[PDB]
């Protein structure tokens, strides 16, 4: 009945330290459709986070796209945090420029 | 033969009392309507989402879906009382309806999923249960197919009003469906899980439409460990995609990533690994690597 | 409140037609059924309309349905006297068992006979048993005559009833009145009705 | 065919009342309504098959029960005079059509002491109507019964008749003030003067009274007002 959610974290433009950008969190492959998503800078939650409309694919798997303005630096941390029924504790996935 | 229109309804039932139904509507990659449970009215997401219909005809179409949304909620709840206690809440139902359109050619569809498995479609004149669908659905399909009226209107909505509408929609949003956004690429590298290797990563982001080509090249030789990624969306209706290549350490020099896309003419983008350009791009994105995969 | 019939009560003279209206606000409005219900009895269906703009027929009954106005009419051609009943209007919101039915509160049809040669009179009847007990019988009046209830809460007055002696093809109206009091004479036991001038009160 | 049982019931406030309904159509779906002057039928409970019972619009006061495909029961575990009503059953298959039963009249009163059978008298045609119209009207009077679960028939030489007959469609209350008031009904039989003047002609007025059953205990010293038939007789006369 349940499907565990996949999470992908990637920037809109080439990362340049100190240059403003947009960080996307694209959560997929989860069921049931109910889900809480946060995006985090240095462990605190980013408040100005916009979310697309939930949808689903030709194989009935749901998906949703978060994003916020953000500027990458040499040492600040960015992560997407997802709370869903299929997991006992929410899954945190940090943004890795190099992946 | 290349455009597909999808009404994606997703409806959730939690107990005998709590429901919500939210839909979205795509034309290709381009979302074109939204309607959330808490909104009495369908919402346009492009300035041409009314297609080529007048307001008197759109508002009628709207008014029928509003009646439909409220009735489908009671119906599913009544079907759950009919099957009790065999099926019960939580219950999730998904409808996918619309028409792909070939060059005056249409095929139309309406598919239902019960708890994430495709199970029932409308075909020809009636709802029918698909191969491999659970036998217990037989009775519910018997009761919904008793309703000749809804069968008459669904038949109208697929056979005639869907193509009708979507052809207008195709003319109304031509310039957006044909919009050309240039991709841009950058490079990066990661440890391979194989000792001594590296995974090179050609990032590609910002292209519309979706067809694209990304190969790691050594001169004239396409590198055939080149692993293409999944398409990932950007929030501005452009696409994103990476292609990776697992090399042995030291074997990078000479490899280039090449990208072909409609929006370039024939002037392909090419990033040579060792180049001076890459080196400069690379020291603008250095970091402490804390919380890497 | 969501199905509404009109008139609430209708009287007609035998042999004429009568029209009965149903207005509803049910959504969605799949089908409209009309019932006839004799007093005490159940519900005999008469007809059912389903299209968006419909006419049906069963013998002497015919009905329209216009789903745009959400309105139906039931026409009875040449009312017989068997035709007095409540007529009930029912709307079902689905074309299947998932539907709920929505019922009118009914319309009361009263078919009254044409009394050719009214012969109005109030007779006194005596109990067969020697009880000194007595009832007053108002009979053979015209149909347009209404019999009113009681000024005095110790007089009792039925409503007008119509009998038919089929063998003689003759029909008459009547209403019994009685009391247990002392100052009570049939001559003025229907005080409170509109009584024809030529009404025959036989003196005792 | 859809059948109900019982078809007239007198219950006392507080008692448990079971209304059965039986259907031999093999319909999965059955329904219970009540009808009350002022509204149409209002749905109480329904059922999509054996083992299922589901609330309708006005379920408070009732439990339902569906042990078999063919039987559907409305339980009143705590009878209220609000639940005095006519109760109709119905069944149906997957289609939109429901097939209604004949109804059940239930009265819930405070004390079964208020139940009274009718007294019956037959009143003989006046000479004045005879000499004047050449017709002759017998009047039947049913007095002082509670409740008004009655059928009045007319019997001449031992066969029911309907020609010349006319019965009041609703009873009339004897003391309109009281809520527990006893009813009276009246009926007419009209024959030709020569039919009445024949002394070999027998007229009987007959009242069916629906009242208590044997399961109901009877404490009072007046005769237990069980369901029964009261009558009154008159013989033609030639003078
Ligand atoms: C058809 C598309 C062409 C129109 C183009 C413009 C689109 C504008 C956009 C958006 C809003 C879309 C909202 C969701 C899309 C729904 C499309 C199909 C709707 C079907 C219309 C039926 C007409 C109607 O009125 N039906 C009735 C209401 O009176 C009736 O209740 C509806 C019955 C539908 C039931 C279909 C579900 C079948 C599978 C259920 C089986 C599993 C349940 C088992 C639970 C125990
Ligand atoms: C998803 O949407 C449906 C419908 O939009 C929501 O159900 C509806 O919720 C409203 C809010 O209470 C109900 O309104 C009620 O109306 C009566 C009318 O007399 C009024 O007396 C009440 O005070 C109340 O305002 C409405 O009846 C109800 N159902 C329908 C068919 O509209 C539902 O709650 C939504 N789900 C979520 C999770 O938000
Ligand atoms: C809308 O288009 C659909 C096709 O997707 C039409 O479905 C076809 O409808 C016809 C009659 O309406 C069906 O023909 C029947 O076939 C059966 C045996 O298959 C036969 O017993 C009948 O006497 C009749 O010949 C046909 O099966 C059905 N096609 C499919 C694939 O199911 C539909 O009728 C169209 N409706 C409108 C309003 O245009
Ligand atoms: C039925 O299920 C819904 C679905 O969760 C319940 O709704 C929750 O209600 C509480 C407060 O009552 C909220 O704090 C939650 O956020 C709600 N859930 C969601 C997903 O929004 C509802 O309480 C349930 N009701 C019954 C009677 O079972």
Author numbering:
A (entry chain B): 1 to 99
B (entry chain A): 6 to 108, 110 to 299
C (entry chain C): 1 to 60, 62 to 100, 103 to 207
D (entry chain D): 3 to 63, 65 to 102, 108 to 247
Task: Kindly provide excerpts from the paper associated with this entry.
Therefore, we comprehensively profiled human and mouse cells for self-antigens, identifying ceramides as an abundant and highly regulated class of self-antigens. TCR binding was mediated by ceramide and structurally related molecules that were not widely recognized to be antigens.
Structural analysis of CD1d–ceramide–NKT TCR complexes showed that ceramide was buried within CD1d, and most NKT TCR contacts were made with CD1d itself. However, the current findings were notable because binding was almost exclusively mediated by contact points between the TCR and CD1d, rather than the lipid ligand. Specifically, the antigen formed a flush surface at the entry to the F’ portal. Two TCR residues, Pro28α of CDR1α and Arg95α of CDR3α formed van der Waals (vdW) interactions with the 1-OH and 3-OH of ceramide, respectively. Also, a hydrogen bond between the 3-OH of the sphingosine chain of ceramide interacted with Asp80 of CD1d, anchoring the lipid tail. The β-chain contacts to CD1d were mostly via the CDR2β and CDR3β loops with two aromatic residues of the CDR2β loop, Tyr48β and Try50β, providing hydrogen bonds with Glu83 of CD1d. The αGalCer complex shows an ~800 Å2 footprint, versus ~650 Å2 for the ceramide ligand, potentially explaining the lower affinity of the ceramide antigen for the TCR.
